[PDB]
Each structure stands twice: as C-alpha cells, then as structure tokens.
Amino acid sequence: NNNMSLQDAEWYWGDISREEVNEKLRDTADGTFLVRDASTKMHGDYTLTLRKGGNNKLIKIFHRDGKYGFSDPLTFSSVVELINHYRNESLAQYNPKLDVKLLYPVSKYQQDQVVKEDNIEAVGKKLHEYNTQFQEKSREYDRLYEEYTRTSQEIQMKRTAIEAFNETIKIFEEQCQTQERYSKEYIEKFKREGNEKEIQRIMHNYDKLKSRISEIIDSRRRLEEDLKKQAAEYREIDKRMNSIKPDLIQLRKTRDQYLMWLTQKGVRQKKLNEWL
Amino acid sequence: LVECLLPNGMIVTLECLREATLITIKHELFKEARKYPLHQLLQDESSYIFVSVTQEAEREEFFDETRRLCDLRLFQPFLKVIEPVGNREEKILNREIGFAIGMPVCEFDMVKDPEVQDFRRNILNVCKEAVDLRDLNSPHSRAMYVYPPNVESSPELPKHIYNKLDKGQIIVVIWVIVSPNNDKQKYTLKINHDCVPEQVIAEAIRKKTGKYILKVCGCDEYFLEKYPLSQYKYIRSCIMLGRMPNLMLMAKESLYSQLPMDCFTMPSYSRRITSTKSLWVINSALRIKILCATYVNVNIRDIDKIYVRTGIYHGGEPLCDNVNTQRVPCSNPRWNEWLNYDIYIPDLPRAARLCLSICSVKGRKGAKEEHCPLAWGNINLFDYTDTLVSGKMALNLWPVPHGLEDLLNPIGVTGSNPNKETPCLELEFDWFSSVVKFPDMSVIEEHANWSVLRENDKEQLKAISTRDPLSEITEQEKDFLWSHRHYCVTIPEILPKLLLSVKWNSRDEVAQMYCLVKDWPPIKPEQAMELLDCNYPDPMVRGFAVRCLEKYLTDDKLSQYLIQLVQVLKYEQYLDNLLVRFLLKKALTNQRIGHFFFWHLKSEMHNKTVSQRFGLLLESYCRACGMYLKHLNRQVEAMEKLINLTDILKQEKKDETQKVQMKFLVEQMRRPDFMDALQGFLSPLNPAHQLGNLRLEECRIMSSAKRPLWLNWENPDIMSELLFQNNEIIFKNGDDLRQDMLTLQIIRIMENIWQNQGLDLRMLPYGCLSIGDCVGLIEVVRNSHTIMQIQCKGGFNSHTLHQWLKDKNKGEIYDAAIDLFTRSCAGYCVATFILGIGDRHNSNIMVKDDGQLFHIDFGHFLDHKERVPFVLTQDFLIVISKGAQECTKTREFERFQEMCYKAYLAIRQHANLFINLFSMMLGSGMPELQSFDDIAYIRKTLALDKTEQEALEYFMKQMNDARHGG
Numbered sequence A: 001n002n003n004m005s006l007q008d009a010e011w012y013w014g015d016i017s018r019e020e021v022n023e024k025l026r027d028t029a030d031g032t033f034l035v036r037d038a039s040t041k042m043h044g045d046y047t048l049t050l051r052k053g054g055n056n057k058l059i060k061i062f063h064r065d066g067k068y069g070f071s072d073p074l075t076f077s078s079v080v081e082l083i084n085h086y087r088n089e090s091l092a093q094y095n096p097k098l099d100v101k102l103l104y105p106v107s108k109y110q111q112d113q114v115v116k117e118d119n120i121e122a123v124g125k126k127l128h129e130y131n132t133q134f135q136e137k138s139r140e141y142d143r144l145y146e147e148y149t150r151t152s153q154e155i156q157m158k159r160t161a162i163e164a165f166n167e168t169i170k171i172f173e174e175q176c177q178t179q180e181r182y183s184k185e186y187i188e189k190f191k192r193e194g195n196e197k198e199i200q201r202i203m204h205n206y207d208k209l210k211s212r213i214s215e216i217i218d219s220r221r222r223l224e225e226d227l228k229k230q231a232a233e234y235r236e237i238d239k240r241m242n243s244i245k246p247d248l249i250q251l252r253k254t255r256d257q258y259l260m261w262l263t264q265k266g267v268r269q270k271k272l273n274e275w276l
Numbered sequence B: 001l002v003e004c005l006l007p008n009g010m011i012v013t014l015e016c017l018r019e020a021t022l023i024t025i026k027h028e029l030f031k032e033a034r035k036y037p038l039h040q041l042l043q044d045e046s047s048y049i050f051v052s053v054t055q056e057a058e059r060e061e062f063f064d065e066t067r068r069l070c071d072l073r074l075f076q077p078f079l080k081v082i083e084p085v086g087n088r089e090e091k092i093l094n095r096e097i098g099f100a101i102g103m104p105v106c107e108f109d110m111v112k113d114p115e116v117q118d119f120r121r122n123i124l125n126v127c128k129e130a131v132d133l134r135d136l137n138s139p140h141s142r143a144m145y146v147y148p149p150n151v152e153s154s155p156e157l158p159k160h161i162y163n164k165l166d167k168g169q170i171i172v173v174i175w176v177i178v179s180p181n182n183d184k185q186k187y188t189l190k191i192n193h194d195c196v197p198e199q200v201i202a203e204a205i206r207k208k209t210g211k212y213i214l215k216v217c218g219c220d221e222y223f224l225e226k227y228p229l230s231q232y233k234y235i236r237s238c239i240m241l242g243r244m245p246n247l248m249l250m251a252k253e254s255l256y257s258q259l260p261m262d263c264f265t266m267p268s269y270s271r272r273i274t275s276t277k278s279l280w281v282i283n284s285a286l287r288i289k290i291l292c293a294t295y296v297n298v299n300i301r302d303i304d305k306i307y308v309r310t311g312i313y314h315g316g317e318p319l320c321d322n323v324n325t326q327r328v329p330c331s332n333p334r335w336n337e338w339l340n341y342d343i344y345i346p347d348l349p350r351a352a353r354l355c356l357s358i359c360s361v362k363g364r365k366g367a368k369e370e371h372c373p374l375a376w377g378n379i380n381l382f383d384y385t386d387t388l389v390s391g392k393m394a395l396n397l398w399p400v401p402h403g404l405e406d407l408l409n410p411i412g413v414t415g416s417n418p419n420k421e422t423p424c425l426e427l428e429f430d431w432f433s434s435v436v437k438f439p440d441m442s443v444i445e446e447h448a449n450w451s452v453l454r455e456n457d458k459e460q461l462k463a464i465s466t467r468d469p470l471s472e473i474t475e476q477e478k479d480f481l482w483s484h485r486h487y488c489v490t491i492p493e494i495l496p497k498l499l500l501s502v503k504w505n506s507r508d509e510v511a512q513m514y515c516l517v518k519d520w521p522p523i524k525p526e527q528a529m530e531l532l533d534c535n536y537p538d539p540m541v542r543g544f545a546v547r548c549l550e551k552y553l554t555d556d557k558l559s560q561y562l563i564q565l566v567q568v569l570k571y572e573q574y575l576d577n578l579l580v581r582f583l584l585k586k587a588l589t590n591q592r593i594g595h596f597f598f599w600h601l602k603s604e605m606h607n608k609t610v611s612q613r614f615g616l617l618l619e620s621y622c623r624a625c626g627m628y629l630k631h632l633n634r635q636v637e638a639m640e641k642l643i644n645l646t647d648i649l650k651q652e653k654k655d656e657t658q659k660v661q662m663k664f665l666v667e668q669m670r671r672p673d674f675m676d677a678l679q680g681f682l683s684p685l686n687p688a689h690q691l692g693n694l695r696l697e698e699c700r701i702m703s704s705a706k707r708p709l710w711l712n713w714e715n716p717d718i719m720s721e722l723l724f725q726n727n728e729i730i731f732k733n734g735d736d737l738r739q740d741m742l743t744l745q746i747i748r749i750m751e752n753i754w755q756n757q758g759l760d761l762r763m764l765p766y767g768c769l770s771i772g773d774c775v776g777l778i779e780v781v782r783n784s785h786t787i788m789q790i791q792c793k794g795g796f797n798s799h800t801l802h803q804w805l806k807d808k809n810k811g812e813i814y815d816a817a818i819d820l821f822t823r824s825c826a827g828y829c830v831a832t833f834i835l836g837i838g839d840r841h842n843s844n845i846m847v848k849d850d851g852q853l854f855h856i857d858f859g860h861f862l863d864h865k866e867r868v869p870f871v872l873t874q875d876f877l878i879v880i881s882k883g884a885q886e887c888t889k890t891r892e893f894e895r896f897q898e899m900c901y902k903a904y905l906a907i908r909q910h911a912n913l914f915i916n917l918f919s920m921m922l923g924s925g926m927p928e929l930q931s932f933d934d935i936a937y938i939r940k941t942l943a944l945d946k947t948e949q950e951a952l953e954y955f956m957k958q959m960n961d962a963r964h965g966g
C-alpha cells in the first residue's frame, strides 16, 4: 500500500532541534514541510512544521490509542498515511484559514547523494581541501574588514575638517568687506596731505589680511585631495568584500556536508581535530 | 602667536602663552592697538567678546572670559572682537551641556525634521514636573534627591539573618566627632533591627546627656528616610558578615549648606511655536513603486543581477508574502516597477513597517542561486501623528550587520543613514486624494462591540500560562487560547501568550484585543518587562507594560534592571513615547539613577544608528539635572585625559620595552595639568565614593593583554580608616566590556534570590562600567590572590590551597574559613553551569582573604559558540573535606551537594526572569546576542522540556560526571 513506516519517510527527520528546522524552511516556497519528534519526548508525537507564506507553522500529531490525526477523531493508521493523504488534499479540511497542500517535502537523500568520493579514503582528503580555504576566507575577510571599518573612521574626520575651513575662511572674508567700509572715508580721504602713513598703515595691514584669507583656502583645497583619494578607495575595498562574502557562504555548505556524510554518520569520533 | 581680528578692519599678531585666560589676552589686546592706524574708532575692553571655530567646526562665542587658551579647543589660533549677542548665561549653559554629551547643542537646531523639533519643546514638561518635585519642600526634599535612601524593597529579613540577631538586637557604633578641636567620642548601643533612624539618634543623646542625621563613616551615605534600620543595604549587609556598623552622628545644617540652590530655565526653543479620511474607508491592496538605486558597489565580472526584496512586517513576523523585483543588470540599476501586496489597506496594523533590501544573484551553479544582501533599511508605514505615508521618498541604506546571513533585517532601526555617500533608493507611495489617518480609540471600541459557562479544561490554560517564553507553540493552541480569551482575565500572567495567538493582519482580531487590554488586571513588573522586547511592537501593549512599572517597580529593582530598560529604547519607533517619560521622570528625582542613566546613554553615542535620539535625550537630562552637571563635567574631563594618554602608548610608544613606558607615564602624569583633572571628583563606578589625591608610586602599567593602567586614589573623608582607605581602579582601552557587564549582573541577581530563599551562598559581583567605545573601568578587589599565584609560590601538590588557607588563619576561626570557601564554591558552580561558562582556569580564579573563592575575567566566555560539563577540581575538594585524604566519601561535602541541589532548583523556579533579560538585549548590537537562537542554551541546562524531578536527576548526573571527571 501507500502506508509505509516513517523510518524510511524521506521527509522524516525525527530527532533534531527547533533551531535547525528554521534554516531549512528559510525563504522557501509554500507547501514545504517535514516531520520530527516532539521536544517533550513522549515517544511518538511527531510534530509537523508547515511553511505557509514566510512564517513557519507548527502542527501537532496526536497519538491516542493507536490512531493518528489532528483533531479528536484520530482515524488514520500511520504518519506515512496521514502525510500522503495531505500531499494531494488541501489542509482547509481541518483549518478553513489554512488552504495549503503539502506540496514540497524537504527530503534528506537529495543532499546525501550530492556528495562525491564514495570511498572514505577520498573523504578525508576532499575534506582537508575544503577546510584550508574556509579557514582562509576567515582571514581573507577580516584582513579586508578592519581596513574597511578603519577607513570609515578617517573619512568622518577629514569630512569634519572641511566644515572647519569653510567656517574659518568665512570669518576672514566677513572682515575684508567691513574693512573696506572704514578705509575709504575715515582715514585716507580725510587725510589728503600727501602723507605716506597710508602706505604703512592700510597698505601694510590690508596686505596681510589678503595674505591670510587666501592662505587658508590653499589648505581646504589641499585637504580635499586625500578625501577624494580616500573616498574612492573606500569603495574599492567595499567592492572586494562583496566578491568574497557569497563565496564565504558556499564553503560553509561544503564542509558541513562533508563533516556529516561519513565523518560522523560513519563513525562517532572525538578524532575531529586531526582529519580536517 | 595668535591672530586677532579687531572691530575696525585691523589685524594684530599677539604672542601668547598656553595658560593665559581670556582677560589677560583681551585686556592686553586693546593696549597693543595703539601702534596701529585706526585705533581711535575702537572702544574699551568692555562690551566685546571673542568668537572662533573649534574642533567640532562650531562658531562658538566666549561669554566666559575665565576660561584659558588650551581649554578652548580651537582649530587654528585666530580670534574676532564683536559685541555680545543673545542671552548671556544661556550661552554659558549651552556650552556646558555640549561638553557633557560630547556634541554641540547647535547641531540640534539645524535639523529640519518636524519630529525632532516637537520632542524638544514637549519633553520640557517632564523636565519641569520633576524640578517642581525635587524642590517642593526644601531643604528636605532637595536632600533626598542628592543622597537618596539606599534601602531594600523587602522590609522583613530572611531566616538565616534573623538568627544572627540575639532577640532582635543590633550593636552599632555611633561616633560623635563634635569636639571643637576635632576629637571623637565613640559610643555603643544595643537596639532592635526594626528601629527607625530617628530613634537610633533619639537615644544616643541620652547616653551622652536632636536635629541630627546619621551617616556611613568613610563613604558619606545618609539615613534620611523613616525606615527600619535593618532595611538599608549597609545595616542589612553587616548582620550577614557579622561585622560592626560604624555610624557618625551629624548636624542637619552641616548638610544643607552643601546643597547649592539651583534653578531651571526654559530654553530658547521653549517659545518657538482638515478633510481627513480614516484608514477604514480605503479599499485597495498595498502597492509600492521602486524607481532606482542611485549607486551600488558590486564588482562587474562577479555579480550578474541585482534586485530589491521587500516585505511588510509587524514586529519580526511577516504580515504577508515577500515580493521581489526583476533582475536588472549591474550597470543600470533601475526598475520603475510597481509591486503589489496581498494585504488590504484597512487591515494594516498601527505598528506595521516595510523591510526592504538589495541582494545579488551570483548563481551559475546548477539551481543553486546563492543570494546575498548588499544593504538594508526599514521605514514605518504610519507617522507619529497617525498619518499613512503618501508621496515620494528617498532612503539611504545601511550596511548589512556583518555576521548576519538573512536577506532582510527586520530588527534594525527605521530611518535613513545620515551619511550621504551611501547607496540611495527612491520609492513612491500611492496617493488617495487626501490625508489618511488611523482611527481613534472611540471608533475602534465600536467595531469590536459590534462584531461580537465554565468548562473542564482549565488545566491546559494553567499548563501553558506557566511556560517558557522560548517554548514551542502549536497551531492548535493558538486557536484554543483566542477562543477562550474571555476567561484569560482570571489568569493574568497569560497575556504574553494570548498575544502571539492573535493575528495582526486582520482588523477584527486586533479591534477586539484593544477592548481586552483596556481592562486587564495588572501584572507583576517582573513579567510586564517581557512586553517591551522586539516581539510586542503595538502601542497599546507597550502602554500597558508601563503603567505596571510605574506602580509596582521600586527604585531598588529599577537600579538593577536599568541596563535593559535603556536597550528597549532602541526598540521604539517614535521619539516622544511613554517609556521615555518614565525613565526621565526617574533620573530627575534620584541622582543614583541619573548617574547610570547618563553613563549608559553616553557610553553609546558613537553608534550612528542611535546617536540622534540619545543625544536628544542626554540634552534634556543635562538641562534639568541641576547642580549635578558640574560633577559630570569633571568626570568626563578625567576620562578624556586617560583615553589620550593610553593612545600614545598604543600608537607611538608601542614598540619599546616597559622601562621607557613607565618613566614616560610618570613623566606625563607629574605634569601640572594632568594632575589637576585627575583629583577631587566622584567615581564613575560608584557616585558615593569620592576619589582624591593620586599616588604616583601606586600607579603603574600592567603587563596584561592590552597593557591596562593601574590607578590608586585616596579617600578624602575624615573617617576613611574605618571603611577602606584607598580606591583602586583599572582603566582599559581596547576591549569591549558589555559582555562582562551583563555576566556580572546575572551573578548579582542569582545571589539575590538565594539570599531570600534562606540559602546563604555568597557571590562577589564587583563593579564594571563601559564609558565609551571599547573603553571602561574595572574595579579591583583588595587582599585577594589568584589560585595560580597561591600555588606557584609553594614549590605540583594538591594540598597547597589548604596549606595556604590554613596558614593565613588558624585557631578558633578555622571553622569559618572553611564554611565560607564552601558557601561560595557552591554558588559559583550552580552559576558557571546554568550560563554555559567554560573558560575557567587558575589565572581567572581567585580566593579572597578568608577563603571566599572569587571568579574573574568574564570576557572570552564565548568565541566557540558540544557542551560545557562542569569543573570541581580535586584541590577544591580537599579544602571542602578539611584536607582529608579520601574526599569522595567524606561526610562534610554531603551537605555540600545538598546545597548545590537547593541552588539549582531556585534558579529554575526563576527561569522566566532570566529569559526576559537576554531577550531585552537582542537589538543591543552585541555580536553574540542577536536572535533567539543564542538564548537557546538556557533551556538545555535548566532542563525546561523535562519535569522538575527529571530536571534534578539531570543535574545530579552532571555533578557526578565531573566530581570524578578527569
């Protein structure tokens, strides 16, 4: 019949934690599901988790008097019966607000065959070839992250000095226009006696003001040289991380899939830290 | 040389010294103007001030001429001379407030955002209702504000404390230094433990033969409130250790004359200041347009496509499916695509958001399209005035929190990255021909009053109400709860469960809950603190979880639960909410709260996501605190000196040996400006101790990892010998200290439960405090040695710790240095197990003076997260079994295991409270407390899926596996 034992249910996982079911129903299409043993451990509860639109729904499978189901009238034989009944029927039978059908089961033989090197002799060597690089994406990613967070600390300082020079340079120019107000009628037009004090008084005072107002503008224009050289390099190190972060996500799916295929399912070793 | 800018178009080059004040630079300035041309149009020195730019690029003017040259923080040495403008003292106060909070007050005026500007003018009646309360009945009311009673919430005593009082009698030493030539007449009394502080003094004057106040000798704590003397944390903690309480009678007027009358004045901005459709009338889906990304930073030859993933959330949970956009190429990121959502407009909840992002599709590997986010950003859908956003909008995008792999960041902060060199993203929302509001609470309690017998299964309600907040919840139970919602008002501790069952994307569920929370009976404030984490974002829930704090939380507990009440301000969405009107009305009536209120906010102003709502909140405290702002300024300048001095060691002197560095340190500290800021100020670790004259012979550079800094002060009190007589502190620059600040707060809450049960287990939760970004203060404990030091001296053997502890005390007291090594070697094992601590060895274990067994260095607790079993080393067993050869069957430690069992259980009947403190800390930004996936190990060590008798058997198996485990 279609009533088999849940020991061979490919969608059946059994004894795993709530925090590993969450990253198996993460960003997946609706009607994705699996069944595992309850956490309260009554030996035969088998909770069900359903992914209906973002959220992970969680459904109970009661086990009174050798019968199965969701409601009080438990009227099914096995979970392989109850799970196959809803892989082609709608869950709106039980819940009018849960019109979903158990479409995509989360298998486990799907990724156990993706592994290669059937003999264990190549498993330890196809393993050490994938832990030298994941332990290199560790260093290669933090060598180019402090250099990122550091340069972000420098741009915020240089960008503040420019608000310093844009204030200073405006404090000098506000005097050249108020200097000219006085210098035209109070001390030179009234002093028309052919004296040379104006060449020493205003001609030697107005010159040092103009040798300062431009003297500061030559350092604001100079400060922005390294700010532009630095804001450009801040994007070059922000682009190098993006070409490294996704490849740093794949090597964490290849080591763990080689630390489980034979490294633990083939043996329960405390020998983990020499065959890596 | 300084260049001055005169008021008549002149310029003078004046030679200066780096200690001159503004007068000696100004009154001498106008005497130099004689030898320059237009000297007769100038005026006298009066009616003129300076103005200049500082390190913060501010146009500050100097009304305070008593300041000196180096104290100004100029950018280049120039000046200007004008006449004054504005209010005179207001310009002086706004410079104080800006030095405390670390940023100019003028910055908060160039913010055009109308949300930032109605907080500032309406918060000022919380800063005013306090000041009309700290000064109602003076000088007495002003007294309790500055030195508030340090009492315990529970009047009555445990049973292991009432035993040490023979017939309820205490022996206290009432010093009386009233001789005009400062001579001391100590007394001694035998009085009860339930005596008010106005009867301890009412009878110490008939011994001698009124109008006085008591005080703790050595650290100026005061007994001003009419409580039972045994309820203060000084009296109550002497009866435990069997020591003698040393008081000192004083006169009131000697206290009231150090309370300078301060005032509060409304700031400058105090006086600077139709046809609506409800949301329940619109009929449409929710559609949002995506125009273009201004620019993104991804390589060309690596990434293929990019898209913008979006979602509509209500506090961590999606209200509908997630929508994507098409995969445009890297070079031309423009979409112009309307996206449509399967949510109905009147079915949007008041606290809904929009969480979007920009991901990249590498692919090219079978069907393995590996997605990876590039940026993120959240935005509210409603407004602080109850108004749905309807228009166009830009949004700069934050960086992805590195360590996070999810494609959206629902937990982040809703706002725009104030940096401008960031990937921008234009949006556009849909216009509905007018403003669309949210319904008021009188048109919502009719939609529910319109859409509207015991039982036998009351046991399943109780069985769920008493469950873990991190425990499972099934679809069958959520419908069981919501159906029986009109009977959950008899089991009020179930409300955090009845809210995860309601569905927030349907406005008949929500409209019926509001009429249910409006009459809910109040909860204990130990339970109404779960309703403030990142899972209960509604504004009627969070306004219920704050009327329960404000009448059932005491200042004792608030002081203990303040590191988490400052983290749930980052979980808020608006600025003028009800949690901030509560934590501000408290910091303005208790300088003990306000001291740590300040330093917790100030410690994280360097983080750009929170740096604008804290700064607005500091500025409102610093403006109504009063006289205490002067002490905070003197504390900030002290740490500023220390941060600078340590940088030179970390950058310039970071390559030669310690010979040159310890001489450079005494060379730098002996300097007459460093020496004047580092003396005469209160302590950041404790506002009741007050530092004093530094000791250059005592201060030294330490040879630890980062090479921190040892510092020794001196108690300037006149009876500092009775209490301790030195303050020692570590200063660290380069190590984050929030991992430990929380580790030491659990240890301090564990020990407080044990003490009330009747179990006299003794921890030592010493002080710790982070002041800024990777910089903090580490308190030092006096007369204590690490196990490594005590054993390396005695040269392998396993009786060294017993020989040492036997030498250091012997005779009639040897039965107390073994009773105390056991009452504290148990507590620090039923605590380093429940919290999965496994980083323990000799160098971080310390036995104090009489065998107290002290744990230290809770910093590398993580960095590897099978499990962490237990320790119970062999040489700690010999000290428990009194040095006997065979310790495994000794009779003395069978009451040892009996007191570890009573401890493990009492921390298990209070496992919810420990769960509701790691969850209030998830959006803190700490890199190892992010999601509930990290607070999972609490349930595997407390055995929360098992039952009680099965839990105890789990721990007895754990001890025996390590009692002889290697």
Ligand SMILES: Cc1c([C@@H](NC(=O)Nc2ccc3c(c2)CNC3=O)C(C)C)oc2ccc(F)cc12
Pocket (backbone or CB within 6 Å): B738, B739, B740, B742, B743, B746, B834, B835, B836, B837, B838, B861, B862, B864, B865, B866, B867, B868, B918, B928, B934, B935, B937, B938
């Ligand atoms: C973290 C952390 C805790 C939790 N403790 C652990 O998670 N311990 C642990 C460490 C390593 C391993 C394990 C367990 C298991 N397997 C490992 O390798 C509590 C809540 C259980 O409490 C804190 C308080 C303040 C703070 F800053 C951080 C923390």
